[PDB]
Design a protein around this nucleic acid. Structure first.
Length: 1294
RNA sequence: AAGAUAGCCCAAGAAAGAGGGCAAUAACCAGAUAUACCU
C-alpha cells in the first residue's frame, strides 16, 4: 500500500472539508501533515520503489515461464534503474522529464514521442538517450540473460501471468508482445501498434509514476464524507469541489443527482413513477440502442418492472465467448480476452448512449442533461464492476439481459444507500430534541450546533463504535428472552414473542370478563414450579432458601409477577437506543437489586471453590493459595481488548514441557501416577490463567521488563525484532504512561480479506509476554515452583473465611440498586450461556478500546470532536460497572449447582433426560435402574463403564445441565447420535493405549499423536462436550441472523428518515400534520418536523408516538413502550391525518410485494421458530437472507455467504458453496400468496465439506492431523441441512 | 428470483480512464466461560 505507515482522515473547519495524512501513533504537532509535507510524503513513497521496478511480477511449462521472467529481471536484463542511471545518473532528470512530457502528450492531443531536446539536453546527447529507451536496447536487455528459444504461446502465457498490473492495458500489452516477438525473431504483424509510443514510453511514465505524482496528493486532499451540511443548514450528499475540467463536469453531474434525490422524495407516487421510467429508458438505451421498441413512444407509460423482468430472460448476448481449451495458464489468457471484450462492448454502449441523450432526448430521459450523464456514468461503472474482477467465465454473465438488470438494480441500490446515508446524518446530528426533556415544543430535523460546521471521519468512527455495540447487545437481548421463556412458557404461532406477553391481570379489550389472549397465564407450563424453574438460571433454587421472596412479592404478587418482572427488564433493553435517553424501571427495582446483592455475596466463595474444583490445593499449601486468592480477587479487574489471550500465549499442549524446562521454571513433581500428573498440569494451567488476567497484565514491574526485553535488539527473524523494538520504543516516547495493554493494542493494530483464510509482530508479542510471565511467576509467586501432592481436605474446609477477606463488590452493590440501566445489563447477561456472556464482555471491551483509539487519533491530529460519546460511560452508566456486572454473569452462568433437585424433580426425571443423549439400553421399566444397570455393566475386559453414576444417584453432568438451560434439546437430538456402548468401548481402549504417554505434550511417533487426538475426540463425545460445540455453532449462526435483523432495521429507519427529510426540504406538496403536530391532550406537545419524530418513535423503546386510536377515534399519545408492530400500526393511524406514507419510497429499499415475507422471515428468526418447527434448514434461512433480506445495499447482501463460510471455518470446517434455485412465497395469505424461484445456497454434493488440518510438531518432524473427525463433520452437515437429508459419505472429503 | 466472495468516496476519463483512500462500512484481525483450537 502506498501510504503504508500513514493514515487518512476527513476534517471539517466551517462547512469546508479536507482529507489529511497523519502519522500514527504520534503527538499533536508532529502527526498531521501540512500541504507541502503531504506532497513530499507521496512523492517520497512513490520513488522509494524505483530500484526494484520490474515489468514482470514475482509443471514443466509453468516452471519454464518462471525461469524466463527471472532471467529478464536479473542484472544486465531489463532493469530500468540501471539503464537510466547510466553515466553517474547524469540523465535521470532528463528521463523523468521525458516521462512527464510523454504522459502530457497523451492527455493534450499531441501525438508522437517527445524529443529529448526539450528535456534540457543537447541534440548530440538527445540521440543517445533515445537509443537507451529504444526498441533495440530493450530487445538487447531482454535477450541478454536468455539462452532458450521461446514461442508465441510462451509469450502469451508470460504476459497474462506476470505482467505488472499498471501495465495491463490493451495497447501496452500489444506493444510488449510485438517487442517480444521481434526480440526472439518470431514472425508477427501488428502495424497499428507502435512499440516505442504504446509500450516503452508508457513504461517510462509508469517507472516515474507521472500519474500518481501529480494526482495522488490532490485526490487525498479532496476526500470527504458521504453527507455534509450545505448553506441553509441542511444535510445533503457531498459534492466535490472540482478544480479541473473533468472535475467540474463530474461535480456538476453529482449536483444533478442531488436534485434528483430531492425531487424523487415525493409523496405523489406518480412523480416517482415518472422519474424511474426516465431512468429505466436510460438503461434500455445503453444496452439495446435508441431503436428499442420501448424508446419509440416518448409518452408511453410502460411498466418499468415488467421491462425489468422481460429483459432478464432475453437470450441476447452482450459478447460472444471464445472456446475454452484444465490448463490454468491458458484460462488466464481466455479470461483476459473476455475482459477486453466486455470493455470494448461497454465503451461502444457508452458512446452511443451519450450521443443519443444529446441528440434524441425529446422527453425520453431527464430534462437535465447533467443528470442523464450521471446515470450513464453509473451504468458504465456498473458494467465495469461486473467484469473488472471476473471470477470465472460463464455464459449467463455474458447475456445482455443479465447485465442490464444488474445495472438496473445497481442504480436503485445507489439511490437506496444515498437516502440511508442522509438518514444516518439526520438521525445522529439533527434529532437532538429526541432526548427526554420537559419542553412542550420541540423541533426535529435541525442540525445541532456542534455539527453545523461539518462532519469529520472521526465522528463516523464514533457512530460505528456505538452502533456495533448496540447491534451486538440486541443479539443477546433476544437470546436472554429465549432462555427465560424456554422452560417457563409454551408459545404458539399467534403469540410467538415472549417479551410481548401481558401481565396476569390483563383482560380483553372488548370483554372485560375474559383474560386477554396474550395474557401470560395462558402460556405458563407449570405455575407451581415457576420460581424453582426461574432460579435454575440463578444457580439453582437451593441457593435461595434464605432469600425473602415474600418481602418483594407481597400482597397479590406471586411468582407470575416474578417472571413478568424479569421479562420486563429484558424487554426494556430491546430497541433501547444508547444515543437518545428516553433510566426509570417499570419492574420491581428492589427485587432485582436484592437478587444482585445476593449473587455478589457468593462470588468470593465461587472463585475460591474454582481453586478447589481445579485440584489446585492438591499440590500447594493452603496459605499460599489464600494469599493468592486475595491478590487476584480483592479488586474487580476490567480487562482490555486486543491483548493476546492466555491460551495463545501458553498453548495447553506445550504447557507441561514448558514448565518442566529448567531454563524457564523447572517445576518438578514426583509421585495413579499419570492420573495426578494430568491433574497437576490442569491445576497449574487454571492458576496461571487467573494470575495472567488478574495480576500479571496490570503489574507495573511487568510493563517495565516487557519494554526492555522487547527493545533489546533495537539497542544492538532478526529483521523483525529491530523493527518491532523500534516501534515499542516509539510508542513509549509518544506517551510514557501507556499501559502494557495499550502497547499491545498499538502494536497489534499495525499487524492487521473479507473471507477467513484457511490453511511477524503477533509471534513476537506472544514470545515477550510468555517470557515476561515466567519471570513474574518466579519473583512474585515462588511457591508454585515447589508443589507436593497430598490428600485434599473437604470443600467446606478450604479457606472458609475467604468471604470476609475480600469485598470487591462493595461499591457496585449500591450503584446497581439505584440504576435501572445496570439492572438491565445484569438480567440480560445473566440469562446467557457462559460462552455468550463472555462474548458480550468481549464486545464491551472492544467498544471501550475503539472509542479510546478514536479520541487518541483525533487529538493527535488537532481535530476538534464532540464528546457526546464518553470514554468511560455507556448510556449514562460507567463502563467499569457494566464490565463488573457482565463479568459476574460470566462466572455464575458457568457455576452449575451440585444438587440434582435444582434442575429435575427426581433421579427418574433426570435419568430419562439423559436417555435423550445416552443410549444406556432402556429396557422399558424405569430409567434410573436401566442407567445403573448400564454403568455397572462390563465395558472392556476388567474396566466397566461407570462415568454416568455416583453412588446411589446418577452423576450430575455439567454439559447435560448447560444444554438444558441454554441449549435446544430437540435440535441436538436431530443432528447428533446418542452415546452408545461402542463409543464407551473405544473410549477405554484408547485411554489404555495412551495411558503410557498421555502427559508429555510433544510426542515421539506420528501414531501416538493420532491416538491422543482420537482419544481427546472420544473423551469429548463420552462427556457430552461435542453437544456443547454444536450448541455454540447453532448460537453463532442464529446470532449472526439476529445481527443482520438489527442491521436492516437500523437502515430501514435511516432510509425513511433520509427520504422524508428530503421530502420535508423540497417544494412537493405536504399537509399540516406531516410537518407539524399540535397535540392538545393532557400530555400536550407541539412537534415541529413531526414526520421525522414519528419515524424514529417507531424504532426507539420509550419514545412516545402520537396517533388517533382505533377504538376511541380520538387523538392520543402512547407511553412509548409498546411493541414495534404496534408502533407501525400507530404510525398508519397518524398518517391518515395527511397514499402509504410508511411505505413511501420503499420501492427503492425493497420489493414491495415481498414486504410481508420479510417481516415473517424476521419474526421466524428472532422468535426462534426454527427450534419448534424445523421446517427450514440453516442453509435455507441463510439462502432467503441472501435472496431478499438485503435488497437495499449490495455490500451487505454479497457478503452473506462469505460470513456463513467464516463462521464454519472458525470451527475448522471448510465448505464449498453451490448456488442453485429454491422456492419462496410472495405475500402472505389473508389468499394471494404465490410461489416463485429463490436463491438457494447449498454445499457441493461431492467433496463439499472437509476439515482443516492441524500442524502437530513432534520431536523430529511434523505430522498433519484432521482437526475434525468424520463424526464431527457429519453433525455439522446435519445442522446445516436438517430437515433435508444428504449423502454425507459422498459430501465429506478425507 | 439467484449463480456470491465486496461496496462507497476522492482522482482520472471519450482516439476513455484505470491512480489513491476507508476501524468512515460491512467483513477481517483479536477476545478464554469449566478443567487433555495446532502451526
Amino acid at each position: 500500500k502506498l501510504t503504508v505507515n500513514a493514515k487518512t482522515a476527513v476534517v471539517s473547519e466551517n462547512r469546508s472539508q479536507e482529507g489529511i495524512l497523519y502519522n500514527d501513533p504520534s503527538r499533536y504537532g508532529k502527526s498531521r501533515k501540512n500541504d507541502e509535507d503531504r506532497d513530499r510524503y507521496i512523492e517520497s513513497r512513490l520513488k522509494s520503489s524505483g530500484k526494484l521496478y520490474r515489468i514482470f511480477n514475482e509443471d514443466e511449462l509453468q516452471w519454464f515461464l518462471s525461469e524466463i521472467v527471472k532471467k529478464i529481471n536479473r542484472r544486465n536484463g531489463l532493469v530500468l534503474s540501471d539503464m537510466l542511471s547510466v553515466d553517474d545518473r547524469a540523465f535521470e532528470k532528463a528521463f523523468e522529464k521525458y516521462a512527464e512530457l510523454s504522459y502530457t502528450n497523451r492527455r493534450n492531443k499531441v501525438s508522437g514521442s517527445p524529443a529529448f531536446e526539450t528535456c534540457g539536453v543537447d541534440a548530440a546527447t538527445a540521440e543517445r538517450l533515445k537509443g537507451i529507451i529504444s526498441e533495440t536496447n530493450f530487445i538487447n536487455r531482454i535477450k541478454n540473460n536468455i539462452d532458450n528459444k521461446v514461442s508465441e504461446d510462451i509469450i502469451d502465457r508470460i504476459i497474462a501471468k506476470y505482467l505488472k498490473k499498471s501495465l495491463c492495458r490493451e495497447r501496452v500489452k500489444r506493444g510488449l508482445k510485438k517487442l517480444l516477438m521481434n526480440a526472439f525473431d518470431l514472425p508477427y504483424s501488428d502495424p497499428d501498434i507502435d512499440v516505442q509510443r504504446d509500450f516503452i514510453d508508457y513504461v517510462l511514465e509508469d517507472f516515474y509514476h507521472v500519474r500518481a505524482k501529480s494526482q495522488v496528493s490532490r485526490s487525498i486532499k479532496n476526500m470527504n464524507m458521504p453527507v455534509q451540511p450545505e448553506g441553509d443548514g441542511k444535510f445533503a450528499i457531498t459534492v466535490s469541489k472540482g478544480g479541473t475540467e473533468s472535475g467540474n463536469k463530474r461535480s456538476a453531474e453529482k449536483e444533478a443527482f442531488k436534485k434528483f434525490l430531492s425531487d424523487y422524495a415525493s409523496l405523489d407516487e406518480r412523480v416517482r413513477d415518472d422519474m424511474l421510467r426516465r431512468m429505466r429508458r436510460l438503461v434500455v438505451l445503453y444496452f439495446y440502442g435508441s431503436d428499442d421498441s420501448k424508446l419509440s413512444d416518448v409518452n408511453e407509460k410502460f411498466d418499468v418492472w415488467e421491462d425489468h423482468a422481460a429483459r432478464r430472460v432475453d437470450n441476447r448476448e452482450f459478447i460472444k465467448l471464445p472456446l475454452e481449451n484444465t490448463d490454468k495458464d491458458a484460462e488466464r489468457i481466455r479470461k483476459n480476452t473476455v475482459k477486453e471484450l466486455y470493455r470494448n462492448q461497454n465503451i461502444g454502449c457508452y458512446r452511443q448512449a451519450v450521443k443519443a441523450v444529446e441528440e434524441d432526448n425529446n422527453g425520453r430521459y431527464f430534462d437535465d442533461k447533467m443528470l442523464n450523464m450521471f446515470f450513464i456514468h453509473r451504468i458504465e461503472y456498473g458494467v465495469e464492476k461486473i467484469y473488472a474482477n471476473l471470477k470465472q467465465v460463464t455464459e449467463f454473465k455474458a447475456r445482455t439481459g443479465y447485465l442490464s438488470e444488474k445495472i438496473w438494480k445497481d442504480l436503485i441500490n445507489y439511490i437506496s444507500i444515498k437516502y440511508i446515508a442522509m438518514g444516518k446524518a439526520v438521525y445522529n446530528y439533527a434529532m437532538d430534541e429526541l432526548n427526554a426533556s420537559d419542553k412542550k415544543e420541540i423541533e426535529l430535523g435541525k442540525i445541532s450546533e456542534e455539527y453545523l460546521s461539518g462532519i469529520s471521519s472521526f465522528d463516523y468512527e464514533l457512530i460505528k463504535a456505538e452502533e456495533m455495540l448496540q447491534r451486538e447487545t440486541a443479539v443477546y437481548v433476544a437470546f436472554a428472552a429465549r432462555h427465560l421463556s424456554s422452560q417457563t412458557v409454551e408459545l404458539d404461532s399467534e403469540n410467538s414473542d415472549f417479551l410481548l406477553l401481558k401481565p396476569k391481570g390483563t383482560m380483553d379489550k372488548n370483554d372485560k370478563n375474559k383474560l386477554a389472549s396474550n395474557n401470560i397465564l395462558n402460556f405458563l407450563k407449570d405455575k407451581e414450579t415457576l420460581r424453582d424453574t426461574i432460579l435454575q438460571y440463578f444457580g439453582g433454587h437451593s441457593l435461595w432458601t434464605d432469600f425473602p421472596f415474600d418481602k418483594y412479592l407481597a400482597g397479590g404478587k406471586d411468582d407470575v409477577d416474578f417472571l413478568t418482572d424479569l421479562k420486563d427488564v429484558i424487554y426494556s433493553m430491546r430497541n433501547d437506543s444508547f444515543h437518545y435517553a428516553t433510566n426509570n424501571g417499570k419492574w420491581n427495582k428492589e427485587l432485582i437489586s436484592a437478587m444482585f446483592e445476593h449473587e455478589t455475596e457468593r462470588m468470593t466463595v465461587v472463585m475460591k471453590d474454582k481453586f478447589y474444583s481445579n485440584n489446585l490445593p492438591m499440590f500447594y499449601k493452603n496459605d499460599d493459595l489464600k494469599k493468592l486468592l486475595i491478590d487476584l480477587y480483592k479488586d474487580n479487574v476490567e480487562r482490555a481488548s486486543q491483548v493476546p489471550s492466555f491460551n495463545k500465549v501458553f498453548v495447553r499442549k506445550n504447557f507441561p514441557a514448558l514448565v518442566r524446562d529448567k531454563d524457564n521454571l523447572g517445576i518438578e513433581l514426583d509421585l495413579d501416577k499419570g492420573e495426578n500428573e494430568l491433574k497437576f498440569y490442569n491445576a497449574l494451567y487454571y492458576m496461571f490463567k487467573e494470575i495472567y488476567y488478574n495480576a500479571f497484565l496490570n503489574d507495573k514491574n511487568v510493563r517495565e521488563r516487557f519494554i526492555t526485553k522487547a527493545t533489546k535488539v533495537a539497542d544492538n527473524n532478526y529483521i523483525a525484532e529491530n523493527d518491532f523494538g523500534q516501534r515499542i520504543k516509539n510508542i513509549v516516547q509518544v506517551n510514557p504512561d501507556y499501559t502494557l495493554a495499550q502497547i499491545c493494542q498499538l502494536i497489534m493494530t499495525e499487524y492487521n480479506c473479507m473471507q477467513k483464510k484457511s490453511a511477524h509482530y503477533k509471534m513476537l508479542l506472544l514470545v515477550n509476554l510468555r517470557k515476561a510471565f515466567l519471570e513474574f511467576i518466579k519473583e512474585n509467586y515462588a511457591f508454585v515452583l515447589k508443589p507436593y501432592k497430598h490428600d485434599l481436605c473437604d470443600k467446606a474446609d478450604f479457606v472458609p473465611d475467604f468471604a470476609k477477606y475480600v469485598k470487591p463488590y462493595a461499591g457496585l452493590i449500591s450503584r446497581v440498586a439505584g440504576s435501572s440501566e445496570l439492572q438491565k445489563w445484569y438480567i440480560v447477561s445473566r440469562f446467557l450461556s457462559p460462552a455468550q456472556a463472555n462474548h458480550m464482555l468481549g464486545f464491551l471491551h472492544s467498544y471501550k478500546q475503539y472509542v479510546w483509539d478514536i479520541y487518541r487519533r483525533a487529538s493527535e491530529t488537532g481535530t476538534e470532536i464532540n464528546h457526546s460519546i464518553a470514554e468511560d460511560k455507556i448510556a449514562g452508566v460507567d463502563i467499569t460497572d457494566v464490565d463488573a456486572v457482565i463479568d459476574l454473569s460470566v462466572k455464575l452462568c458457568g457455576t452449575i449447582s451440585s444438587e440434582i433437585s435444582d434442575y429435575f424433580k427426581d433421579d427418574e426425571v433426570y435419568a430419562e433426560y439423559i436417555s435423550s443423549y445416552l443410549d444406556f439400553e432402556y429396557d422399558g421399566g424405569n430409567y434410573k435402574d436401566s442407567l445403573n444397570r448400564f454403568c455397572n455393566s462390563d465395558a472392556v475386559n476388567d474396566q466397566k463403564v461407570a462415568l454416568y453414576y455416583d453412588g446411589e444417584h446418577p452423576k450430575l453432568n455439567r454439559n447435560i445441565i448447560l444444554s438444558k438451560l441454554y441449549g435446544e434439546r430437540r435440535f441436538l437430538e436431530k443432528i447428533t447420535d446418542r452415546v452408545s456402548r461402542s463409543d464407551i468401548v473405544e473410549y477405554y481402549k484408547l485411554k489404555k493405549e495412551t495411558s503410557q504417554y498421555q502427559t508429555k505434550g510433544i510426542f515421539d511417533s506420528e501414531d501416538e499423536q493420532k491416538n491422543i487426538k482420537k482419544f481427546q475426540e472420544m473423551k469429548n463425545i463420552v462427556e457430552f462436550r461435542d453437544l456443547m460445540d454444536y450448541s455454540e455453532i447453532a448460537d453463532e449462526l442464529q446470532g449472526q441472523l439476529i445481527n443482520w435483523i438489527y442491521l436492516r432495521e437500523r437502515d430501514l429507519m435511516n432510509f425513511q428518515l433520509g427520504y422524508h427529510y428530503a421530502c420535508l426540504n423540497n417544494d412537493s406538496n405536504k399537509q399540516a400534520t406531516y410537518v407539524t403536530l399540535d397535540y392538545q391532550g393532557k400530555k400536550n406537545r407541539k412537534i415541529n418536523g413531526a414526520i421525522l419524530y414519528q419515524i424514529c418513535a417507531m424504532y426507539i423503546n420509550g419514545l412516545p408516538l402520537y396517533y388517533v386510536d382505533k377504538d376511541s377515534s380520538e387523538w392520543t399519545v402512547s407511553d412509548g413502550k409498546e411493541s414495534t408492530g404496534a408502533k407501525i400500526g400507530e404510525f398508519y393511524r397518524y398518517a391518515k391525518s395527511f397514499s402509504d406514507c410508511y411505505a413511501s419510497g420503499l420501492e427503492i429499499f425493497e420489493n414491495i410485494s415481498e414486504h410481508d415475507n420479510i417481516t415473517e422471515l424476521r419474526n421466524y428468526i428472532e422468535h426462534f421458530r426454527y427450534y419448534s418447527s424445523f421446517d427450514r434448514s440453516f442453509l435455507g434461512i441463510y439462502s432467503e437472507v441472501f435472496d431478499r433480506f438485503f435488497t437495499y445495499d449490495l455490500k451487505y447482501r454479497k457478503n452473506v455467504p462469505t460470513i456463513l463460510y467464516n463462521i464454519l471455518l472458525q470451527h475448522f470446517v471448510n465448505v464449498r458453496f453451490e448456488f442453485v434455485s429454491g422456492k419462496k412465497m410472495i405475500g402472505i395469505d389473508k389468499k394471494i400468496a404465490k410461489e416463485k424461484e429463490c436463491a438457494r445456497i447449498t454445499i457441493r454434493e461431492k467433496n463439499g465439506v472437509y476439515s482443516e488440518q492441524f500442524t502437530y510438531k513432534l520431536k523430529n518432524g511434523t505430522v498433519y492431523v484432521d482437526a475434525r473427525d468424520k463424526r464431527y463433520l457429519q453433525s455439522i452437515i446435519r445442522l446445516l441441512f436438517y430437515p433435508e437429508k444428504v449423502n454425507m459419505d459422498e459430501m465429506i472429503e478425507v
